[PDB]
Design a protein around this ligand. Structure first.
Ligand SMILES: *P(=O)(O)OCC(C)(C)[C@@H](O)C(=O)NCCC(=O)NCCS[C@@H](CS(=O)(=O)NC[C@H]1O[C@@H](n2cnc3c(N)ncnc32)[C@H](O)[C@@H]1O)[C@H](N)C(C)C
Length: 681
């Protein structure tokens, strides 16, 4: 027979516990606001019962009422002390229960008066569990209140250990409390960092390559039409050029431009740059001189490895080292002493720019080794395999063709320029020589599925939305996904049946992929969001673009992990595979090229007769997006004149397929161009 102080924050004042206490003729005072020592109520309180109160009482108040302040906290203390106990008890998968304990100096650390276990079914939502636990602890309080008042119960100190969480710890998970226990723990596995001690990377690529050369020295390494070089021959010739290159001042993180057609000299030059210590800057010779001079200027590359056929195209801007000049090779054929760390730059490839000119993507040796070290065991690549070096060597799809197969002892086959686009002769060569594994761009892959091939066992594809699955061959089709920034690819799917949306697969080694909403919070399984990549595949950033590195390579505020903002939208499927749901941004992947349609606008608008331009992507029935360039000009400009105009500054793949002349552009109510209202032919 006294007075009771009920201190709560979220709970309702019409609770069963409150009504029960008043039924025992106890006058109860409900108070949610902060109480201080000078409060007029503190002198008339006989008992203080708190129940998930959102604040701590001043140490003066807690000591004055020592031995008479109790808290009903619905967790199995010491597990899940403090905030959001039920959620953390489920996420961390700790034992579950409710505990009525004394309040001591710290948060939910006092001795336990009463403790009871509870169980949650898999189908219950986190709200159901929260409610079920709240009901169980209230009934526990109703049965044991008489024992608590009379002090009959013997409090016992908490076990040593436990965890602790604060209010902000849940910000990252605010959108998650609406999911079944099964679905929640399913997301936890898909977003669980691998167990502490995960295999790191200590070696550089050429360290592993030379090791593999000494394992299969007389095995065919590279094949170019009739000629071919073995691993021993390739390793020695590259070492000769590397000694000469190193002797000319090539240092770690230095850039060495390479401008050559696909050939044996290319592979020799590529490895020579690595062994020398620097990173190679591939420059497709089909680029216009404007583009070539730009890459040479922006990149801090003084050395340009090229031939005499294309030497003049550089206009003496760089100290040229002709790959045909015999004095470019030293007598020394031994492997050079390794001077590179896995954190050093291995190459700098150029992709399209977001707002303006393109940015050199810096890829490290720890981003290529991780990819090759996963590729070889997963696909079971062996020296018996012969791989096609098909993709243009300025795109990282060529790094897949070349580097992953060399570490596996396989043989590289440079695709002859004549048979490159005549897939009939390519398939003929592949059936004759026995080409077993190769990566083919989506365009070439679909065309190859029609052939009656029987030699290949693994064809890897990717880069564009695959739609055709039917093929007469017995080879496993593999669909891969990943941006250049995250090293070649990050996910892999084994295609087995038709799908309305062929998934891109599961993450590769040491790669976590997070689906986050606009607020960067985790998305529940089945909820769309931005695909965030975490792990060893992350690059060093963009060359000479630190502002974009900070924007795209962010350190998560709650998690603290370094992640790359891809700008891509994706979702986790229930089975773990990822579904690609397009991209927020202006970009679009057209036949293997990441382009900014707006990055053509300055060149185009710079034309005297051109006032405004907007390049959109339109698909004709079969879903394949192509670019139409609408422009407002007085008179229509000849199609070929614009293609040559863009050809002076842009590569062929950045030249829109169609250009449409218009007298004026349609506008929205807000003044924006009404992109929806533009025609198409
Ligand atoms: P023609 O055009 O004049 O001659 C060209 C031909 C036709 C001969 C062609 O065979 C060729 O030579 N292609 C070489 C060009 C090339 O290799 N480009 C690189 C491909 S993109 C690369 C990484 S990326 O640059 O960052 N772009 C990937 C982004 O696109 C999305 N993506 C990735 N995978 C996708 C699939 N399977 N479907 C749909 N979209 C996909 C992501 O947002 C990526 O950010 C990727 N990684 C490939 C696989 C190397």
């Amino acid at each position: 027979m006294g007075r009771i102080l009920f201190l709560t924050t979220f709970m309702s004042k019409g609770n069963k516990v409150v009504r029960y206490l008043e039924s025992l003729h106890h006058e109860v005072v409900i108070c949610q606001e902060k109480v201080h020592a000078q409060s007029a109520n503190l002198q008339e309180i006989d008992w203080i019962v708190s129940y998930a109160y959102g604040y701590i009482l001043d140490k003066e108040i807690v000591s004055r009422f020592r031995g008479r302040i109790i808290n009903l906290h619905p967790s199995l203390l010491p597990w899940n002390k403090g905030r959001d106990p039920v959620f953390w008890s489920v996420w961390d998968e700790t034992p579950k229960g409710v505990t009525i304990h004394l309040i001591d100096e710290h948060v939910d650390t006092g001795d336990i008066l009463v403790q009871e276990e509870i169980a949650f079914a898999d189908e219950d939502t986190l709200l159901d569990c929260y409610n079920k636990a709240n009901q169980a602890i209230e009934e526990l309080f109703i049965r044991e209140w008489e024992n608590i008042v009379h002090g009959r119960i013997a409090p016992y100190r908490q076990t040593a250990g436990g965890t602790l969480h604060f209010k902000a710890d849940r910000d990252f998970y605010k959108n998650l409390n609406m999911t079944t226990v099964r679905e929640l723990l399913a997301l936890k596995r898909l977003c669980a960092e691998p167990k502490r001690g995960e295999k790191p990377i200590d070696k550089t690529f050429h360290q592993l390559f030379e090791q593999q050369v000494e394992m299969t020295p007389d095995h065919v390494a590279v094949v170019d039409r009739g000629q071919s070089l073995t691993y021993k021959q390739l390793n020695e010739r590259a070492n000769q050029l590397a000694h000469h290159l190193r002797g000319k001042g090539v240092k770690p993180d230095d850039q060495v431009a390479i401008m050559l057609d696909k050939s044996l000299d290319m592979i020799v030059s590529i490895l020579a740059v690595m062994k020398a210590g620097g990173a190679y800057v591939p420059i497709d010779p089909d680029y216009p001189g404007e583009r070539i001079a730009y890459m040479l200027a922006d990149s801090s590359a003084a050395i340009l490895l090229t031939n005499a056929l294309h030497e003049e195209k550089a206009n003496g801007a760089c100290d040229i080292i002709d790959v045909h000049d015999p004095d470019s090779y030293s007598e020394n054929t031994n492997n050079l002493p390794h001077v590179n760390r896995p954190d050093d730059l291995v190459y700098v490839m150029y992709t399209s720019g977001s707002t303006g000119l393109a940015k050199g993507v810096m890829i490290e040796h720890h981003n290529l080794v991780n990819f090759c070290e996963w590729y070889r065991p997963y696909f079971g690549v062996t020296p018996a395999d012969k791989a096609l070096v098909y993709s243009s060597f300025s795109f990282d799809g060529s790094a897949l063709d070349i580097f992953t197969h060399l570490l596996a002892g396989a043989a590289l086959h440079i695709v002859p320029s004549e048979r490159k686009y005549d897939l009939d002769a390519l398939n003929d060569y592949c059936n004759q020589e026995g080409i077993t594994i190769s990566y083919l761009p989506t365009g070439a892959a679909e065309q190859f599925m029609q052939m009656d091939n029987q030699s290949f066992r693994v064809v890897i594809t990717g880069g564009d939305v695959l739609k055709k699955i039917e093929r007469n061959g017995t080879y496993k089709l593999y669909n891969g996904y990943g941006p250049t920034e995250c090293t070649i690819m990050v996910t892999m799917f084994e295609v087995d049946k038709p799908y309305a949306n062929i998934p891109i697969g599961k993450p590769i080694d040491r790669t976590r992929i997070l689906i986050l909403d606009e607020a960067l919070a985790l998305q529940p399984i089945g909820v769309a969001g931005e695909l965030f990549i975490v792990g060893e595949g992350l690059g060093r950033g963009y060359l000479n673009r630190p502002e974009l590195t900070a924007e795209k390579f962010i350190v998560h505020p709650q998690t603290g992990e370094r992640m790359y903002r891809t700008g891509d939208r994706a979702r986790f499927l229930p089975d773990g595979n990822i579904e690609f749901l397009g991209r927020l941004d202006n970009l679009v992947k057209i036949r293997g090229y990441r382009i900014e349609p707006g990055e053509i606008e300055p060149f185009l608008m710079n034309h005297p007769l051109i006032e405004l331009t907007t390049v959109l992507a339109k698909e004709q029935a079969d879903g394949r997006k192509y670019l139409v360039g609408y422009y407002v000009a007085p008179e229509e400009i000849p199609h070929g004149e614009l293609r040559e105009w863009l050809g002076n500054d842009l590569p062929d793949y950045m030249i829109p397929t169609y250009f449409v002349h218009m007298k004026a552009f349609p506008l929205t109510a807000n003044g924006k161009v009404d992109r929806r209202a533009l025609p198409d032919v």
